[PDB]
Amino acid sequence: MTPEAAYQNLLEFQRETAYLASLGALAAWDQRTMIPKKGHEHRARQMAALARLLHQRMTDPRIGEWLEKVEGSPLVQDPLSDAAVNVREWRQAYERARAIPERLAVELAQAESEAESFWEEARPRDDWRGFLPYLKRVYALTKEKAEVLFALPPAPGDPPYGELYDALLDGYEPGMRARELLPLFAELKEGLKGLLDRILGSGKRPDTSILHRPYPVEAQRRFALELLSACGYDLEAGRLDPTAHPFEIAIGPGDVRITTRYYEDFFNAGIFGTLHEMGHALYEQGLPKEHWGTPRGDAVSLGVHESQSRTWENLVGRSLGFWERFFPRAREVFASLGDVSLEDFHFAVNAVEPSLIRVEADEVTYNLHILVRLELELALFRGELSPEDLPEAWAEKYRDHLGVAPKDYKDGVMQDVHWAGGLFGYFPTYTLGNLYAAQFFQKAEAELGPLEPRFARGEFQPFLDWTRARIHAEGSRFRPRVLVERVTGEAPSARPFLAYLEKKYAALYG
Amino acid sequence: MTPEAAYQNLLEFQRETAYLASLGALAAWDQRTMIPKKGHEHRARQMAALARLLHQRMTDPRIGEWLEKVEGSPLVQDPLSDAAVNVREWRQAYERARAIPERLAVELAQAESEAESFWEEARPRDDWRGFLPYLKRVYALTKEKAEVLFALPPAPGDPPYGELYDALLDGYEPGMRARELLPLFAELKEGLKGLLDRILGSGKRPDTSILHRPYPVEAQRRFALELLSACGYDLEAGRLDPTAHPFEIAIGPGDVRITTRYYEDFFNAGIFGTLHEMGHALYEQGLPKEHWGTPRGDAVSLGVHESQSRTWENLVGRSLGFWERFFPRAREVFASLGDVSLEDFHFAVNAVEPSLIRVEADEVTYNLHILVRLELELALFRGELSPEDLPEAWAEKYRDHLGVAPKDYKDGVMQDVHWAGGLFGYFPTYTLGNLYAAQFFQKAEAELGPLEPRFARGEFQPFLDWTRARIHAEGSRFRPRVLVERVTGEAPSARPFLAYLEKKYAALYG
């Protein structure tokens, strides 16, 4: 068996797994939108059976045989080639899937399910004491999983793991290590606190009460569809439906779906949430279809994915140019806007406020919430902090980073599901997406010409085409750090994000 | 390995296949309702990958090992026991799936796909000449499949095959043979022609033009939902959505879905079509959930399934009692009914008319369309008729059975897709469903008391509970012929259907 024959067998087998898994993607979409109230228990059973099948296919020893025969062949010598890109990822997933003992996968999966469902009810009850045993168990098995993965050799071509955490972080953000995040976030922290301090001393507005007037849900839907169409989302290849928790989900080429949630009495949630999910969807629709089902045709990381959602939510969607374009229409469709000026509205949708809850934070304060979760997760995995001491260390860092501290557990350390779901090394990606987005955006402006005037006329397609040629077309060919450097000429940095904020908020807050 | 251990292994393996297949059911639902216009090609690829997986699981040699160890064991000696019912079906599907050579399955699947897509365009063009080669090929491979299946021993406990056709018919209608259909349909034919002849000589009405006034689509939807709720469809366990071609589809316990099609200018299609699909759904919702995924928990045949759709479309839905109940509401919601009396409306929805097109036929003429297709299919498989001579033999039997003959191919021998899709031995089930339905209905009235008065007050739940205890609860425990006899005390017969028609139409047509 030549390396070419083995590469074909491996591509066919891996592509078939992706097709079967995408029926899982469809069922997950349906579970959150169309499913009958009484159909959930069966759906879970269906998902569980699919998961067993995929676990068999992802650990089939044939994958090792074929990989053994392809690796070191000429076919893969060029790291930039499709085959090298694919095999690099296939090897790394195979090795990680085979290295976890079933005993450990099963206990971890069970502990995360128990802690998630206990957390649903315990957060409204402010019940740390009863939640902690569940979180303690999830941490432990997560830590045990980290050690297993750490002891594997990293993928050929990437920075080695520096410490335990990196083995978790690498799953969500290939190639990203703590020793790169440290300087990145230190620079961001200093710049955000200085900018917050200047906003706090401004004595200017914003009139957020404008956003809490009435905004009929059905008019929000119609207005969001106009926005989706003008920005370039292909509605013939997607759809928009209501859900309890907005998400985007890619079913396959020609089928990328958005969901959102509207609030009769809050403009932001449904409009900017639709735009945020549109950004994700635009990435998925711009990936190269001839590589669907392979690593060359998959999104490269959560950071880059979040860079595309945040590009369209904030850098476009919350910009002066965007609203110069669409504010007249909004006054036509929303009675609560009849007596509202463009300047008031643009300032209102960009209000800044230190607050306890991350998922409600403005773009200036949001990333400080991520820093504290990062700082705590590193303390945990470095063995310097214990889950029992998490509530005090949480408020300590909320006071130093944001200048406000929780008075309870509900709106404090228990506010997010992530840790109960065993999502450690996940949070930094939210911030990486913001830093990447501004860095991409700055190069796009430098190559395309300033974009505010173009947005004001509704011309979004050149910037969209630019993100396709620079980012979406590449799939997983380049690790994020390398992709950022190929598009922008420099390694990931916080300065473009800070420059973007400093200019935008120097103008709004005088 | 005991027989008990083998039966458990076999139940676990077979139930898991059903769960994976039900993700196929979900994707098929989505393909006809929610899928984006550009997502079809991927969906087909997903369906194709699922089909390969299922084909592997359905022919896994382990099924033969486990069956070998269970068969002849005490566990299965009682033919009425769950294990016997299950193993009977598992063996028969395994043997039929293993007996078809891949060469033959692949050519047949290909020939049916080619002939279906060629038939879509060729029927509007009246293009027999170009369609015939495609149909000729599908017949041949279908005939070859019949011979393979015929040469297997029939399932222990059922009538032997009498001739080639029975091997096809048995797949759609377990245990049903041509030599039972012959007397059944001969009796039906004589009775329908006599009743048609009396209707034709009546000189009474019906005013069908009432049904072609306007009926706003959205009011049809709201009215159908009232009907669904009153008849006992569990909307918390289902849903109703528009589609191009109505169907029902069961995804799992708690999740049984209906689709329908409304016409602004034709009342019947969307209302009675919703009721027809509701009948299917009511069967699926009444199957016993603790046996989901096994033959004991599956619908037993297309005839019985169609008996439940036709029960609710016609025996309930087109009855005087039903409209005594719901006609006032219909006059409240439909302006075109303001000047219309109950007597006019009930006669209109029950109009009878010999016509060329089966899918538009009234309940008195519809089954004669099935007889001719049966007569032609038997001629083909007995080697007495050739596909080339099908257009003449078609019009000959349309003249003798219905007294009207097609003038072209479009609205003649090419009107239905079935033969191009290789659905031979399928059509008789439509009529078996009508005969069963009336036979069930007659026993229900004899045990429950006349139902017209109960319908007139909206009391549908006792009859629904009766169909659950008599039919739905049984799953596939009894072959249809045996199930009809356990519920009604007699073997399937045409007389209850004819008695039902004779009384209903003696009154409408004087």
Ligand SMILES: [Zn+2]
């Ligand atoms: Zn996001």
Ligand SMILES: [Zn+2]
């Ligand atoms: Zn039907």
